[PDB]
Amino acid sequence: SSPDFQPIPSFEECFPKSTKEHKEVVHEESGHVLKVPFRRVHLSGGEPAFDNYDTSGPQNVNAHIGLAKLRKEWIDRREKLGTPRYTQMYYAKQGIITEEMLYCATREKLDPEFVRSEVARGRAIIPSNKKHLELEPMIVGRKFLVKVNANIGNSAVASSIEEEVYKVQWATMWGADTIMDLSTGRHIHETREWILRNSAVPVGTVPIYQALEKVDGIAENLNWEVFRETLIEQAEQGVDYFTIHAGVLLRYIPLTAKRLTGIVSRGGSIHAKWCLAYHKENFAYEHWDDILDICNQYDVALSIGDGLRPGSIYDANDTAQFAELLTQGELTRRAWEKDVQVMNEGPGHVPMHKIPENMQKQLEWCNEAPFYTLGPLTTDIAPGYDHITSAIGAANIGALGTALLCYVTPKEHLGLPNRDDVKAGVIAYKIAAHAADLAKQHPHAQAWDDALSKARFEFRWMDQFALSLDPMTAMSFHDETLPADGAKVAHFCSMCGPKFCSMKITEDIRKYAE
């Protein structure tokens, strides 16, 4: 009821020379003024300031009070107008550009009509439960910037409410575009409430985890009714998207019998246990229409789970995995008939040569719905470094069109990630996501690389650091060998020294040619 919340390091400490800014735009139908966040990096030497994306949200807000309910007037006005369904897809299909769509368009530097079109056709989603009034809207889709999710949450073995709220603020400081609260320990409802009220980014959950808690860990005591009540509980708090493993069908379970690592999905294994116990079809599949009815009233997006994802290179792209993908497509099309926003969850552990098949089949079988991958990890050999093994896969599958990359931290396979691991995972995934944006030739993505590289060539060291994903790491690393203030304007570093610095030699070469 009153956790001992501690503040994360300030925006200014994390991003020296940056300021938080907002672009003001007017939603013309309503007259509502939207303040769309961005981060301005102030540079030297006559360079214009560099504007970048900003997920960090409002700063220095007491977590006991929570964030401003910025969407309140939007939601209240739409309610007063009256509507049969509350989803961004419903509105988009009516030809309506909502505040959320305009906010996202502004944030992406794209046309609001283009945003509306992408949402209406099911190729992008704006996860934005009407009860998450604190949310700064964002969009997930192949035509937009590649996004990153940070998974947090406690377990029965580790962590606390205070630490999980810290982790959400911290994850978003470093660039997480969404978070999920995957708590499987104590105080699931309360932890999630504190997170939602203090999160400017979309928050996802996997409702089956709490449903299993509601029945004291006895999977056989799950059923639709327990699950339904969990969905409503979570929707009422403002959860923006639910992972639901409705594609783990009874008949697909035996396809996993010869796998090396079996069913590694937590939710998938829970559904599989129930299905086998009763020899009955997955209750989330059976009640898909009823789930859609809930989602329509709040705008909860559905992230259709991949409970049969491969958990080892050995199992990659096997029959079980693709059987579920086929069903994910069926469920996607059914959700769209009710105007429910959908993305599809994907692998997993997948060696690089098997990555293209994953994207090809998803794009076709799921009608281009946004894809949301866990990595993939490209090799199993390096626990402790699975942020790297998976950054390779995530960058690759992102380049092929994957819209949301679920991070993997250095603690993958080993233990619950702490705040440091969360940062490491977010950084690795921001690298993968941006590398993918470059590969897709996404408009203006290279401007960031160019600004940093120009600062590098010109020996504007502080500008170089300020422009990077993690300024203080770059600065500290440089300063381990050359800490003096004068070195911040030196035309070399300790790698080559003054006489061998190649950019300084180029500098002399060009001066001589002048």
Ligand X SMILES: Nc1cncn1[C@@H]1O[C@H](COP(=O)(O)O)[C@@H](O)[C@H]1O
Ligand Y SMILES: C[C@H]1O[C@@H](n2cnc3c(N)ncnc32)[C@H](O)[C@@H]1O
According to CB under 5 A, which residues from 129 to 168 bind Fe ion?
none
Partner interacting with residue 206 (select from a second copy, Cl ion, ligand X, none; CB below 5-8 Å by kind): ligand X
Contact with ligand Y (CB under 6 A) among 153, 247, 398, 410:
153
ω into 348 cis (within 30 of 0): yes
Q: Is residue 509 a contact point for ligand SF4 (CB under 6 A)?
A: no
According to CB under 6 A, which residues from 173 to 192 bind ligand X?
180, 182
- Least Å distance, CB 411 to ligand Y, is 8
Q: Is residue 412 a contact point for ligand X (CB under 6 A)?
A: no
| Sequence-ordered alpha helix ranges (H) in 338-370 | 355-365
Pick between residue 20 and residue 504 the one whose CB is nearest to ligand X. 504
Pick between residue 261 and residue 297 the one whose CB is nearest to Cl ion. 261
ω into 376 cis (within 30 of 0): yes
Print the SS3 string covering 389-453. HHHHHHHHHHHCCCCEEECCCCCCCCCCCCHHHHHHHHHHHHHHHHHHHHHCCCCCCHHHHHHHH
> For residues 262 and 271, what is the distance between their CA atoms, to the nearest angstrom?
14
Q: What angle do CA 56, 62, 127 make, to 5 degrees?
A: 45
Pick between residue 37 and residue 305 the one whose CB is nearest to ligand X. 305
Q: Is residue 492 a contact point for ligand SF4 (CB under 6 A)?
A: yes
Q: Is residue 156 a contact point for ligand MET (CB under 6 A)?
A: no
| Footprint on this chain of Cl ion (rule: CB under 5 A) | 413
Burial class (CB in 10 A: 0-12, 13-18, 19+), 254: exposed
According to CB under 8 A, which residues from 277 to 316 bind a second copy?
277, 311-314
133-141, 183-191, 354-362, 495-503 -> range binding ligand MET (CB under 6 A): 495-503
Contact with ligand Y (CB under 6 A) among 126, 171, 176, 182:
182
Q: Is residue 416 a contact point for a second copy (CB under 8 A)?
A: yes
Q: Is residue 65 a contact point for a second copy (CB under 8 A)?
A: no
Nearest alpha carbon to residue 151 among 461, 386, 460: 386
CB 207 within 8 A of CB 460: no
166-174, 237-245, 306-314, 452-460 -> range binding Fe ion (CB under 5 A): 306-314
Q: Is 86 assigned to a binding site?
A: no
Q: Is residue 428 a contact point for a second copy (CB under 8 A)?
A: yes
99-107, 191-199, 231-239, 424-432 -> range binding a second copy (CB under 8 A): 424-432
Contact with ligand SF4 (CB under 6 A) among 35, 109, 413, 444:
413
CB 488 within 8 A of CB 461: yes
Name residue 18's beta-bridge partners.
41
According to CB under 6 A, which residues from 397 to 436 bind ligand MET?
412-413
Q: Is residue 496 a contact point for ligand SF4 (CB under 6 A)?
A: yes
> For residues 374 and 468, what is the distance between their CA atoms, to the nearest angstrom?
25
Partner interacting with residue 311 (select from ligand X, ligand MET, ligand Y, none; CB below 5-8 Å by kind): ligand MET
Count Cβ atoms below 10 Å from residue 363 Cβ, excluding itself: 16
| Sequence-ordered alpha helix ranges (H) in 53-135 | 72-81, 88-94, 99-108, 112-120
10-18, 75-83, 371-379, 435-443 -> range binding ligand X (CB under 6 A): 371-379
Q: Is residue 156 a contact point for ligand SF4 (CB under 6 A)?
A: no
Q: DSSP states of 196-213 as a string?
A: HHT-SS-EEE-HHHHHHH
H or E element that contains 34: strand 32-41
Q: Is 434 assigned to a binding site?
A: no
Q: Tell me which DSSP letter residue 130 carries.
A: T
According to CB under 8 A, which residues from 198 to 227 bind a second copy?
209, 212, 217, 219
52-60, 283-291, 466-474, 494-502 -> range binding ligand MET (CB under 6 A): 494-502
Tell me the per-residue interface mask from 274 to 313 with ligand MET, x by CB under 6 A, - otherwise.
-------------------------------------x--
Helix axes 502-513, 446-457, angle to 10 degrees: 80
H or E element that contains 181: strand 178-181
Q: How far is the CA of 499 from the CAs of 477, 481, 483, 503, in angstroms?
A: 21, 16, 19, 11
H or E element that contains 33: strand 32-41
Partner interacting with residue 184 (select from ligand X, ligand SF4, Cl ion, none; CB below 5-8 Å by kind): none
Number of residues that bind ligand SF4 (CB under 6 A): 8
Q: Is 197 assigned to a binding site?
A: no
CB 406 within 8 A of CB 391: no
Q: Is residue 408 a contact point for ligand Y (CB under 6 A)?
A: yes
Pick between residue 302 and residue 377 the one whose CB is nearest to Fe ion. 377
Query: How do beta strands 32-41 and 18-27 pair?
Result: antiparallel
Q: Which residues bind ligand SF4 (CB under 6 A)?
A: 413, 492-493, 495-496, 501-503
- What residue numbers does the annotated binding site cover? 151, 180, 209, 245, 265-267, 306-309, 345, 349, 372, 413, 493, 496, 501
Q: Which residues bind ligand Y (CB under 6 A)?
A: 151-153, 155, 182, 374, 408, 412, 416-417, 495
